[PDB]
Design an enzyme around this catalytic site. Sequence first.
Site, short mmCIF file in Angstrom:
data_model
loop_
_atom_site.label_atom_id
_atom_site.label_comp_id
_atom_site.label_asym_id
_atom_site.label_seq_id
_atom_site.Cartn_x
_atom_site.Cartn_y
_atom_site.Cartn_z
N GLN A 1 1.45 -12.14 10.38
CA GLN A 1 1.85 -10.92 9.70
C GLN A 1 0.91 -9.76 10.01
O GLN A 1 1.34 -8.62 10.15
CB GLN A 1 1.91 -11.14 8.18
CG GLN A 1 2.56 -9.98 7.43
CD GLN A 1 2.00 -9.81 6.02
OE1 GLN A 1 0.78 -9.81 5.82
NE2 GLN A 1 2.90 -9.65 5.04
N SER B 1 4.34 -6.36 3.27
CA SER B 1 2.95 -6.51 3.68
C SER B 1 2.11 -7.16 2.58
O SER B 1 2.20 -8.36 2.36
CB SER B 1 2.35 -5.17 4.14
OG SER B 1 1.13 -5.39 4.83
N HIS C 1 -0.86 -4.00 11.40
CA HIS C 1 0.37 -4.64 11.90
C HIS C 1 0.59 -4.33 13.38
O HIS C 1 1.71 -4.41 13.88
CB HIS C 1 1.59 -4.26 11.05
CG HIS C 1 1.47 -4.68 9.62
ND1 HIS C 1 0.96 -5.91 9.26
CD2 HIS C 1 1.74 -4.03 8.46
CE1 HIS C 1 0.93 -6.00 7.94
NE2 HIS C 1 1.39 -4.88 7.43
N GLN D 1 0.82 -1.20 0.00
CA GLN D 1 0.00 0.00 0.00
C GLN D 1 0.86 1.26 0.00
O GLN D 1 1.87 1.35 0.69
CB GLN D 1 -0.94 -0.02 1.22
CG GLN D 1 -1.96 1.10 1.24
CD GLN D 1 -3.30 0.70 0.64
OE1 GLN D 1 -4.05 1.56 0.17
NE2 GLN D 1 -3.61 -0.59 0.66
#
Length: 307
Positions: A248, A90, A199, A9
């Site tokens: 994650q 990510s 996260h 992102q």
Amino acid sequence: QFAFVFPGQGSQTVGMLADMAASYPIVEETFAEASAALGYDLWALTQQGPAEELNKTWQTQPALLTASVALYRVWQQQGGKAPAMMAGHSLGEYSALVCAGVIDFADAVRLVEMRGKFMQEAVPEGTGAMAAIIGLDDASIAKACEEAAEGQVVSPVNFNSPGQVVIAGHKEAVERAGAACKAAGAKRALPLPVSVPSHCALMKPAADKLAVELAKITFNAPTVPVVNNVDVKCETNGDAIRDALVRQLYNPVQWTKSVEYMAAQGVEHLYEVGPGKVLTGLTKRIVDTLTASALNEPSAMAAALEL
């Protein structure tokens, strides 16, 4: 030896990959596969926007994954050799796992759409925040976050390079933590266009939902090592990779250490297989003797295939 790194992102822009698509039909063919899985025209979304639609994370994610897979497909089609290793930031981890043959492309497109939805719904808008901490050492930041939490949640969520670290959590705690970081000598603490506090612990219940979806999807052994975000490990067990994707979501992305790890394995160059040059720019800040470049323009693609 080179590795492929895949962005997440923030790296999307309206019009991305336009030039590559004009040089390589496999790009729009790849996007047509994705769009069939999604039930809308993903290419048109990327080309026409508007930005506000492309930036909604349950659309951003499939858009980015598709872009990266399309670029990988161009590389392979044009005779490019497999990289020694892969890693992704990510969302980018999913891209790597597709290119390494672990997850079926269409499965992954649907998966990351659901990931984005789970993430978006995790907390009420206005509950979370993210901040970039600039020019403070990793340890001082973790301590600032510990001190600032006060029974809310705030923690480092992206270790992007030495002196660039994102924190996230409850808005109020992210404020406190920012201030403390400044007090501890940080050059800046910049508030981001967050919302979704990725996260950190706030993503648990989203992760638990993701786990249920991941379990439905076949995972194969990787054909090239993928360094994971959560543990900086190259897992090969399908079910271990799955578990690493769950973890994650609510744990920090260890990008700094992942790049160090690749360097330690003998990787000399990182090619950024996605739009933008974000991971490219991080690379030398992590290991100053590493080189990096992006593979999202035709000429760059050509120049790399000549090597």
